[PDB]
Amino acid sequence: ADLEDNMETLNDNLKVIEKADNAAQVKDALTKMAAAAADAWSATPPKLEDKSPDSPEMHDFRHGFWILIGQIHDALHLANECKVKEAQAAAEQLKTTCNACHQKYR
Amino acid sequence: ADLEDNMETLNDNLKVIEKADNAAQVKDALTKMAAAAADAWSATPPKLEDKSPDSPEMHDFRHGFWILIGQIHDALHLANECKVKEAQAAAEQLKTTCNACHQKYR
Amino acid sequence: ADLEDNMETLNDNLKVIEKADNAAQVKDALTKMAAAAADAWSATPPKLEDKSPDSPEMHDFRHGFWILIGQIHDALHLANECKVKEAQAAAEQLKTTCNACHQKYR
Amino acid sequence: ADLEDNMETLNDNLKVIEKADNAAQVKDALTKMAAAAADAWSATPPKLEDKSPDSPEMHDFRHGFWILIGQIHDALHLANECKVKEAQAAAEQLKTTCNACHQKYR
Ligand code: HEM
Ligand code: HEM
Ligand code: HEM
Ligand code: HEM
Ligand SMILES: *C1=CC(=O)N(CCN2C(=O)C=C(*)C2=O)C1=O
Ligand SMILES: *C1=CC(=O)N(CCN2C(=O)C=C(*)C2=O)C1=O
Ligand SMILES: [Cu+2]
Ligand SMILES: [Cu+2]
Ligand SMILES: [Cu+2]
Ligand SMILES: [Cu+2]
Ligand SMILES: [Cu+2]
Ligand SMILES: [Cu+2]
Ligand SMILES: [Cu+2]
Ligand SMILES: [Cu+2]
Ligand SMILES: [Zn+2]
Ligand SMILES: [Zn+2]
Ligand SMILES: [Zn+2]
Ligand SMILES: [Zn+2]
Ligand SMILES: [Zn+2]
């Protein structure tokens, strides 16, 4: 999907996680966020529409997505361990990464 | 791109790295390998054409890709620090991941 | 060194990074922070004086340190690439991990 | 503990894992390996007895330990998830990191 699409999936599922009861729900939202962050990898954000896929800026843009994926990766391990609250907190702590990218590139 | 496609890109660029001279070329192959692993995320491998995108087998399939992406992520940092040999050895060490997935799922 | 000791080193060096000018200084503080987090691993926090080194509470306690070590690991790659600001900021985003552990275990 | 000590703990527990019948056992060996790897962080290997802690060689030495720790971290999530065989295989694939460091620095 497109960039703004993937972002919505990220945002919608964050909320699903905030409010979830049980591990199953959390696993699911995380799985969708994971796919969304992976698909987002290829994108070019408007603010650097011109630049080439080699700018220190594209390389730094894409870096924030490795961080995100690493973190979704780990949050999900917690969910598989039935550590519902610990996973929910890992999800809350992702926002730091979301915000970090947004302040630079959005 | 398709899954066999992405696998070719992975395998072609591993050779490019094996034989490369200087930092710049290594960076490039890894970058291409990164994109390929990210796209490969959403894929369903023939051996699991039946199971839904939730079976412990799909979750495990995709797990192997987080491992690889993390490892490509790190080799590329090495390439940026002008440590070329270190980066090729990280590249060679990846294979341990390639092989691991292949003998479960290929 | 002791737990509170290591925490001081973590906190002191965070500030050193906040205010640093150039790559070299950032590398140093992170290096010191790395060693402090690694040494912190074996520690038992007062609040879990009650639990053996196998409680889902010690394992979770130690988990927070893997997160931090990974994050120090990555900040430092940034510093080696001379990306001073990018590093300083990775450093800022760490606090999310500090805070997360403190809220649970301090 | 000392460096050769930590290496024994790593090697002994690798075996314990290769042998191990049930998940509880695997968790234990990995936990011991993680502690060992963390404590090994601060060590200076004979081959680099002279060099200051700031040589690209000490930096690279310690780097191999972050890799190791990252992989022990992950293998343990597999164990908590009751996936015994997958954890065993993550453990075997660690050897790649052991060997990599030994060929350079042992
Ligand atoms: C992390 C979990 C995360 C969230 C959540 C998130 C949300 C988000 C929203 C809701 C938008 C759009 C606002 C709107 O459409 O009105 C948005 C947009 C962008 N994001 Fe984002 N985002 C998260 C993560 C990240 C990360 C990690 C990056 C970079 C590494 C990133 C980047 C962007 C960009 C660029 C946009 C705007 C694109 C556009 O509008 O054309 N996001 N995000
Ligand atoms: C790691 C860098 C990596 C490489 C290299 C690689 C190569 C590769 C090749 C050459 C094929 C060829 C198929 C053919 O000739 O018919 C192939 C196919 C598959 N792969 Fe792969 N692969 C690497 C990594 C990984 C990882 C990390 C996974 C699992 C997450 C994985 C899986 C698969 C699967 C399944 C196939 C079968 C697809 C098919 O033949 O239709 N690979 N790969
Ligand atoms: C992250 C880099 C980080 C910082 C910074 C930090 C700071 C810190 C302070 C300032 C104290 C109080 C000491 C004093 O007043 O003299 C403190 C104490 C504890 N910490 Fe911490 N800490 C950081 C990281 C982490 C992480 C990642 C964890 C757990 C996984 C953690 C835990 C604790 C605990 C527990 C204490 C109190 C225990 C005690 O012996 O009093 N910290 N930290
Ligand atoms: C990975 C899990 C791993 C294992 C296993 C391992 C084992 C090991 C043994 C058995 C020895 C020999 C001990 C002796 O000299 O009596 C040994 C020695 C060294 N190792 Fe090791 N080691 C593993 C991992 C790693 C890693 C990741 C590094 C470096 C980053 C590393 C280093 C060393 C070094 C140096 C030695 C020699 C020290 C000495 O002989 O005094 N090991 N290891
Ligand atoms: C790899 C080694 C190197 O020196 N360079 C250029 C120098 N440089 C840094 O050391 C940090 C940013 C930078 O440009 C490399 O690219
Ligand atoms: C997954 C979460 C949960 O609690 N259970 C039951 C017990 N169990 C584990 O927690 C890990 C392996 C195991 O059987 C789950 O299966
Ligand atoms: Cu898309
Ligand atoms: Cu769309
Ligand atoms: Cu759209
Ligand atoms: Cu749309
Ligand atoms: Cu020791
Ligand atoms: Cu001893
Ligand atoms: Cu001894
Ligand atoms: Cu001894
Ligand atoms: Zn974890
Ligand atoms: Zn690294
Ligand atoms: Zn990085
Ligand atoms: Zn022994
Ligand atoms: Zn994992």
Side-chain angles (χ1 to χ4, degrees), chain B residues 4-80:
Chain B
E4 288 192 28
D5 259 18
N6 288 314
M7 289 302 157
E8 258 304 32
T9 308
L10 284 184
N11 194 224
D12 277 13
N13 284 279
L14 225 38
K15 297 168 176 181
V16 168
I17 296 164
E18 187 173 350
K19 318 214 183 51
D21 289 345
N22 70 113
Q25 210 162 357
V26 176
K27 289 191 219 180
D28 226 0
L30 250 13
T31 297
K32 296 182 180 171
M33 281 182 90
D39 199 73
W41 183 263
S42 29
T44 309
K47 215 179 160 165
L48 323 169
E49 264 185 33
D50 45 312
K51 341 233 199 192
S52 71
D54 259 37
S55 26
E57 339 227 2
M58 283 309 278
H59 295 297
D60 183 15
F61 181 79
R62 288 172 310 246
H63 187 271
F65 283 127
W66 274 319
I67 298 296
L68 192 62
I69 285 172
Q71 297 177 117
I72 289 152
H73 168 206
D74 194 63
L76 181 56
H77 278 311
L78 289 169
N80 308 345

Side-chain angles (χ1 to χ4, degrees), chain D residues 4 7 10-11 14 33 45-46 61 65 98 101-102 105-106:
Chain D
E4 293 177 350
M7 292 301 155
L10 290 172
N11 197 215
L14 226 43
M33 291 181 78
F61 179 74
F65 284 128
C98 310
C101 182
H102 296 159
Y105 299 103
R106 186 147 70 176

Side-chain angles (χ1 to χ4, degrees), chain D residues 10-29:
Chain D
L10 290 172
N11 197 215
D12 273 359
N13 288 276
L14 226 43
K15 289 159 177 187
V16 172
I17 294 161
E18 212 183 301
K19 323 279 150 60
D21 294 319
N22 82 95
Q25 298 187 294
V26 178
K27 289 192 215 183
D28 223 1

